[PDB]
Ligand binder design. Structure first.
Ligand SMILES: Cc1cc2ccnc(N[C@@H]3C[C@H]4CC[C@@H](C3)N4C)c2[nH]c1=O
Length: 130
């Protein structure tokens, strides 16, 4: 229905805004674009589903997220990939893991404060009806 199209459009607007706020935070620059194969050629082999904030924006625009829950799965993926690929005690690895956890925590905190639980429930019920 038109009501439902409006609901998903509002979802996309909300998700773009959250994603933009993550993308402009200097701590999260490393997560704004796909990993360059020249610098990290073993990344494509180690990490089976790469994810980054530009790809998140592309997915929003492709209507790939019908709930905030599905969006947060990709945020969690950005984080889990960082923990998996950079597991060492090296300060470089520890920094990226801290930033990854910070990205995840920040996304969840914005959503906890600004997502109406009844809006998310509506999205889930439209999604589950298809
Ligand atoms: C998204 C992303 C980007 C990225 C860019 C550059 N290096 C990385 N990791 C290095 C692995 C080894 C080699 C050096 C250090 C840091 N670790 C010990 C990266 N890791 C990522 O997860």
């Amino acid at each position: 229905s038109m009501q439902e199209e409006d609901t998903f459009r509002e979802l996309r607007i909300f998700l773009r805004n959250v994603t933009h706020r993550l993308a402009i935070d200097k701590r999260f620059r490393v997560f704004t674009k796909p990993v360059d194969p020249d610098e990290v050629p073993d990344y494509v082999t180690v990490i089976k589903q790469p994810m980054d904030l530009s790809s998140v924006i592309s997915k929003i625009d492709l209507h790939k997220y019908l709930t905030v829950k599905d969006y947060l799965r990709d945020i969690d993926l950005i984080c889990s990939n960082a923990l998996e690929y950079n597991p060492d005690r090296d300060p470089g690895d520890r920094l990226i893991r801290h930033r990854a956890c910070a990205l995840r925590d920040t996304a969840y905190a914005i959503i906890k404060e600004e997502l109406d639980e009844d809006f998310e429930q509506l999205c889930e019920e439209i999604q589950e009806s298809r």
